[PDB]
Amino acid sequence: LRVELSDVQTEYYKNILTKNYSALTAGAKGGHFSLLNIMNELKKASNHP
DNA sequence: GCCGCCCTGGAGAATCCCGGTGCCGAGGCCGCTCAATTGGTCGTAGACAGCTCTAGCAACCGCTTAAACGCACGTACGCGCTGTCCCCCGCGTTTTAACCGCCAAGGGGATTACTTCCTAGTCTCCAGGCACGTGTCAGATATATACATCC
Structure with a gap:
């Protein structure tokens, strides 16, 4: 399941x-x-801000 | 009538202020003068790119085990108080040498200029010492096996 990112995750x-x-x-x-x-840190940002 | 004593006024000298002139500290100006600047040339130090291999890093695991931590007790030591005595401080007096100003001549050392030559930089070529890898060899260590012996 591929899901998009939030605005906080994107920034x-x-x-x-x-x-x-x-x-x-x-x-x-x-x-x-x-x-x-x-x-x-990229994986941490992809998981949860 | 003659002589002695108390009260008050104007002129001679001391002091403050101002102007003209001479001397000390500092800055502008001038002259030498050597080191910073400018311009040109060239070599190379370092920036950049590229490939290879090793260490570090974030975040997680699992296991072991020794270090860390918490707590209770006890007692040794830090600290406060008091006494005491002794030694350092304050002061007065006397000495003495530091300090400053003096010879008296001579050598040491800092500069300025000059001469000379020995020695260290630079360049080229070469070879052997240092770094790395490996075959081999003698000393150290562990066990296999045979002989004397006690129960």
Whole structure:
């Protein structure tokens, strides 16, 4: 069963794939986003934001 | 009538202020002058691309087991109080040497300019030392088997 993505999933996917550390931080107080293992973060974004 | 004592006024000298002129610190100007700038040439340091192989990383598993953690108890030590005595501090007095200003000549060392030559950079060629891989060999280790012996 192939299902589409939400808007949050799509914006997280384009933020990870076109790396946007300033945009990926946004409202986070810590701001510690790790983009080592890009494809694992892509799978995490495809599963749940 | 003559002589001595108290009260009050104007002129001579000291002081504050201002102007003209000379001296100290600093900045503008000028002159030398050597090092930064400009322009041109060329070699190569590094950026870029490409392929191969190994380490790291996120997130999960499973097993073991030793380290971590929590708790209770107990007692040793940190800490506070008190005494005591001794040694350091404050002060007065006396000494003394640091400090500054002086010879007296001479050598050491910093510059400026010059000469010379030995030695280290550079280039070319070559060979052997270092790094890596492997065959072989002697010392260390484990067991197979035979002989003396106690029950």
